[PDB]
Design a protein around this ligand. Structure first.
Ligand SMILES: *C(=O)/C=C/c1ccc(O)cc1
Length: 100
């Protein structure tokens, strides 16, 4: 499948969410955009190795990291590879997701 892609602001609010990501997770993009990724849609990502690294990277202005993660919240459990990095646009961060 095509990468899943999510664009977040620095607080973790979902600004963009593509169809491929919804195919991985079962989420309808229009129902999650505008909600908080870490505190509402994806609470299983509220961990030091995901959310904690996100916040560090937002703070430092240097976010660019890759890691494996399990997406198992209100979906058939799926191992994924995550790449999060700062965007070019203002107050924007990308999360790219591939099944592994
Ligand atoms: C854990 O709560 C993960 C949930 C999640 C991951 C990625 C998404 O796009 C949606 C939900």
């Amino acid at each position: 499948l095509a990468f899943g892609a999510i664009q977040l602001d620095g607080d973790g609010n979902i600004l963009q969410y593509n169809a491929a990501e919804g195919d991985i997770t079962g989420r309808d993009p229009k129902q999650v955009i505008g909600k908080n990724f870490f505190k509402d849609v994806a609470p299983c990502t509220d961990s030091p190795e995901f959310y904690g690294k996100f916040k560090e990277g937002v703070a430092s202005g240097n976010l660019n990291t890759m890691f494996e993660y399990t997406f198992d919240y209100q979906m058939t459990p799926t191992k994924v590879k995550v790449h999060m990095k700062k965007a070019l646009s203002g107050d924007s961060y990308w999360v790219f997701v591939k099944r592994v």
